[PDB]
Amino acid sequence: KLKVLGDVIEV
Amino acid sequence: KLKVLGDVIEV
Amino acid sequence: KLKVLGDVIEV
Amino acid sequence: KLKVLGDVIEV
Amino acid sequence: KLKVLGDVIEV
Amino acid sequence: KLKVLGDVIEV
């Protein structure tokens, strides 16, 4: 199954 | 740290 | 169209 | 609650 | 390579 | 603004 891993970033 | 866990869908 | 839905989590 | 709405791209 | 760009939203 | 940068994986 596809899954998203990521980061929150302030822009 | 703020991380993201998510799913992919077709819309 | 592909689209991501997810949650922010503190690690 | 903090949710994520995003897009998938090819880079 | 696939990559996710998105926004954090308060729900 | 809080943005997301992430990756797609198969789990």
3-state secondary structure C1-11: CEEEEEEEEEC
Q: Residues for chain B: how many in total? A: 11
Does B4 contact D at CB distance below 8 Å? yes
Distance between B3 CA and the closest CA of chain D, angstroms: 11
Q: Residue A4 carries which side chain, given as an amino acid letter?
A: V
Query: Token pair of D10, please?
Result: 């090819």
Q: Could you tell me the resolution of this structure in angstroms?
A: 1.4
CA C11 to each of CA B2, B3, B5, D9, E4: distance values in angstroms, whole numbers, following the listed order: 6, 7, 11, 26, 20
Residue where the block lists tokens 């929150």: A8
Q: Residue A11 and residue D4: Cα distance in Å, rounded? A: 15
Q: How was this structure determined?
A: X-ray
Residues of A in contact with F11 (CB under 8 A): 1-3
